[PDB]
Write a protein that binds this ligand. Structure first.
Ligand SMILES: [K+]
Ligand SMILES: [K+]
Ligand SMILES: [K+]
Ligand SMILES: [K+]
Ligand SMILES: [K+]
Ligand SMILES: [K+]
Ligand SMILES: [K+]
Ligand SMILES: [K+]
Ligand SMILES: [Mg+2]
Ligand SMILES: [Mg+2]
Ligand SMILES: [Mg+2]
Ligand SMILES: [Mg+2]
Ligand SMILES: [Mg+2]
Ligand SMILES: [Mg+2]
Ligand SMILES: [Mg+2]
Ligand SMILES: [Mg+2]
Ligand SMILES: [Mg+2]
Ligand SMILES: [Mg+2]
Ligand SMILES: [Mg+2]
Ligand SMILES: [Mg+2]
Ligand SMILES: [Mg+2]
Ligand SMILES: [Mg+2]
Ligand SMILES: [Mg+2]
Ligand SMILES: [Mg+2]
Ligand SMILES: [Mg+2]
Ligand SMILES: [Mg+2]
Lengths: 123, 130, 123
RNA sequence: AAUGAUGU
RNA sequence: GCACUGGUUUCAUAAGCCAGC
RNA sequence: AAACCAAUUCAAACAUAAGCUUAUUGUUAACAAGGAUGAAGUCGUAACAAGGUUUGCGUAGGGGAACCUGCUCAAGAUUAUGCU
RNA sequence: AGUCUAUAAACGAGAGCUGCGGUAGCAAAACGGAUUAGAUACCCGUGUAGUCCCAGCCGUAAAUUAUUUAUUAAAUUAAAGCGCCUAGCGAUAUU
RNA sequence: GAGCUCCGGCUAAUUGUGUGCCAGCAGCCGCGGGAAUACACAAGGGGCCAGUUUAAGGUUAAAACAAGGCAACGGUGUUUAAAAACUGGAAAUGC
RNA sequence: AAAGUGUACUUUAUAAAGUCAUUGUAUUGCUUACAAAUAACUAGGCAGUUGGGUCGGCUGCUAUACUAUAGCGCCCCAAGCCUGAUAAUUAGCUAGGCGUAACAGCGGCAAGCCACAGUAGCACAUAAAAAUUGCUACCGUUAACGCAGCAGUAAGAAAGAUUGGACAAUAGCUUAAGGGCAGAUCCAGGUAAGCGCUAAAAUCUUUGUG
RNA sequence: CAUAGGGUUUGGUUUUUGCCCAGCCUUUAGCUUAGCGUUAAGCUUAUACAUGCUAGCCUAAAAGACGGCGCACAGGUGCAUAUUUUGUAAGCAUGUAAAAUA
């Protein structure tokens, strides 16, 4: 059914992206090689390369799986990771960490409650 | 599929053209049988001398016209063509002379014996090669 | 059949008709009453059964049986019709749902109130 | 020597 | 005259019969 | 510049949306027929026994109705007194 | 040099139709005499088409047992190629 | 604990009162004509359960390729027969 | 090409860089075969129709292959081509999915491909593109508009949810001064698929007191 | 991980054919209904639509788009389409061609 694409794009870029596969307030991500301009959860892919569980477990750590050999192959071909994927690769030691620009905007004071009306009802 | 076919010539009425018939089977999952079907293909004939009834081999080729996308490569069997002049000669030979009951039977026996002897020699050679 | 006969459309799937063709494959249908009267059953039964002639919203006209003891249906009354055949009445293949727009429930009913559109007495 | 009401 | 009601009859009914109106 | 590119202008050709016709699609109709069904109307008695003229098929004619008669055919007709 | 037949064609009782010739016997229809509650039937007396010959039309029957191979007294057993049936009831439907 | 439905047989679950082929019930066979476990109500009991019981669709309860009939009814009037499918056969002449 | 180049643009007592313009070994591809619902109370269909020859089929700038999709178009020439064809009815296709021991049957969910945006004909738009781009005619309301984008309203129907919050996360557009945009998306509201738990107190749970 | 039947046609029996019921899956209607967390979902009209919103950002030849990049991505529906499509397989010439290194 979901045959992987073989021909490379001619007018767009390839990227390594995170695909949301969680539940209500229980995120879970899968890393795949997809065309830059598509739907987030589109079935068009070249390969699935890893997974990530951002929440802590009883051991206090987050868990991350990746294909070491295939990550190098797609990086060589020209696939461009997103900002978050760069962070995962940097910490995992696959490639050097990417520096971030300086920030001046006053950070948001309501980040975990601004978008959740249920909490605001109690507030 | 459809790269090569072997079929019979059913039409030579076109200029450097021919139509060839092909047989094939299709699997019917519900009844567990193979169904025999037929198709017609038009091919390019450079020689322009094909005869209806020949067995020929056609091969995939670049499109040449609306309904012609094949080329004739070789002929496996040539169709028989009646020739009045040759038939008349045979009739004259048959009517030239007649033999009796015994003479005809003896001649038939001798001819079979000679054919059998040659066949035995060929078979022995084949065994020697083996 | 032979193999040749089976290949040439030998077998044809059996077709079965519906029991309430006037419903057009719908669970219910709305209509308006044209005439209200009584009819006598076939042998060996004997009674004066209440029936009404209803024109459905799709334009069809059918005979509907009124269950229960007593009714307030008159001409030009909106009713809801379902499937169901009365065996002793010839030609009646539909029934009127009681308790809906115009039809009311049987007064004094205590058992099987749901099938006759009677609410539970609070007192 | 025409006829043999209905239901069970 | 019919009609209508009641009786008669029967396991019950129809019909028949009878009376009233 | 006689070349190319971006414009304005008139003329000719091309096909075409649109447009016209169209059987007969559906609605609808005085009236004359058919079929199905319905506790207890009427005339006859055609079939089931040898059913009281054996039954039936094809075709033709006739009769209030079932049915009747001619011609060939079918059995789906069970048919008990030899010889000299 | 075969089996079977999608499709196509030919042959085809009796009755019936058109023309020509013939018409004894038999006999639809028809007309009388009886039987019977009635007899519009059965029975009796007359009796025309028809039955017959030649040339055309019609193509219908309760117009035989499905066809073929092997085995077989039959049968039975296993195969090859077809046609038809899918509760009954109900059209002079349309084409 | 709280509702919906059912208690003649298929199908787990009965007594009383009222009605008297009336009122009504009904998926099928069927109940009601003065002695109704089948109608209406009361009590008792069965099933499921924040659900429960009708109505309407898909599929199953072998429609038959595995796997049905022409022996209840169906093989057609007969023969000839260059498609298709299957597949070797015992013919012609003379007094 | 995650590249090179510039008499070009911007920032610097701190300088690395980016922005704009331009550049690729032939400079963005066509063709054929098989399968897939009913249907003969649809039997004939086709005349550019089947085949052959010249010419045309543009957007240049390696060399040959004797011109290297095509009745795709004009002119000419030869009569061929199809025949369960032609004409009709119905349906978006694949597949997850539901029943069944299976074979078969039917078509709610995630995703892929195709078609369309009131109807029809056209221009751009080739190669990845027209809901929110144009021209013309027509239909319906009132020179304008067409919600099959989210929410919402009216009618129809047995039966179709709020005129909600936020860009905090994921993906996307723009930007070297680290920002801006977003009814995709993430959360909340509403509707008895389904799954889990509560609807009673107990030495104030000896996982205690001290 | 592997195939279940029962009722019915009123002289009896055997036999053939039809009809009805028990399962699972999916929507409405009657009666009834406390709360919290969460999975999968919005199944009839390509019927007509008031109002708000869904694609903009950046720069500048004199403080301004006329210029650059996007709208070729997302989101909606299944009118039309029996094959124009969908699902698959196959085909498409050359040592990439030049130059005394005499
Ligand atoms: K009642
Ligand atoms: K005859
Ligand atoms: K006969
Ligand atoms: K049968
Ligand atoms: K016959
Ligand atoms: K269109
Ligand atoms: K709809
Ligand atoms: K640019
Ligand atoms: Mg009840
Ligand atoms: Mg009488
Ligand atoms: Mg008599
Ligand atoms: Mg008699
Ligand atoms: Mg008799
Ligand atoms: Mg005979
Ligand atoms: Mg019991
Ligand atoms: Mg019961
Ligand atoms: Mg009761
Ligand atoms: Mg459609
Ligand atoms: Mg349009
Ligand atoms: Mg787009
Ligand atoms: Mg609209
Ligand atoms: Mg909307
Ligand atoms: Mg971002
Ligand atoms: Mg409900
Ligand atoms: Mg099951
Ligand atoms: Mg830029």
């Amino acid at each position: 059914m979901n045959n992987l694409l073989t021909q490379l794009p001619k007018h767009d870029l390839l990227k390594i992206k995170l695909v949301r596969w969680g539940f209500n307030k229980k995120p879970f991500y899968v890393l795949s090689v997809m065309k830059r301009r598509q739907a987030r959860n589109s079935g068009n892919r070249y390969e699935d390369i890893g997974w990530w569980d951002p929440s802590p477990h009883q051991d206090g750590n987050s868990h991350f799986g990746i294909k070491f050999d295939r990550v190098k192959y797609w990086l060589s071909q020209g696939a461009v990771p997103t900002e978050k994927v760069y962070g995962l690769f940097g910490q995992a030691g696959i490639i050097p960490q990417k520096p971030a620009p300086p920030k001046y905007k006053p950070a948001d004071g309501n980040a975990d409650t601004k978008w959740r009306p249920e909490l605001q009802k109690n507030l | 599929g459809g790269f090569e076919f072997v079929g019979k010539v059913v039409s030579n009425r076109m200029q450097k053209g021919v139509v060839v018939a092909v047989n094939y089977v299709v699997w019917i999952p519900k009844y567990k049988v193979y169904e025999r079907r037929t198709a017609r293909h038009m091919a390019h004939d450079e020689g322009n001398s094909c005869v209806i009834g020949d067995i020929v081999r056609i091969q995939q080729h670049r499109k040449l016209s609306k309904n012609k996308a094949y080329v004739v490569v070789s002929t496996l069997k040539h169709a028989d063509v009646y020739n009045a002049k040759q038939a008349a000669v045979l009739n004259t030979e048959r009517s030239q002379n007649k033999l009796g009951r015994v003479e005809y039977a003896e001649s038939r026996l001798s001819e079979v014996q000679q054919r059998l002897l040659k066949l035995r020699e060929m078979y022995q050679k084949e065994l020697a090669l083996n | 059949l032979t193999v040749g006969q089976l290949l040439r459309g030998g077998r044809t799937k059996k077709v079965r008709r519906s029991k309430s063709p006037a419903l057009e494959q719908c669970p219910y249908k709305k209509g308006i009453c044209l005439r209200v009267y009584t009819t006598a059953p076939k042998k060996p039964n004997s009674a004066n059964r209440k029936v009404c002639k209803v024109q459905l919203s799709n334009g069809y006209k059918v005979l509907a049986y009124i269950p229960g003891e007593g009714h307030n249906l008159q001409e030009h009354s909106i009713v809801l019709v379902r499937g169901g055949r009365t065996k002793d009445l010839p030609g009646v293949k539909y029934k009127v749902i009681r308790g809906k727009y115009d039809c009311a429930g049987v007064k004094g009913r205590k058992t099987s109130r749901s099938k006759y559109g009677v609410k539970r007495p609070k007192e």
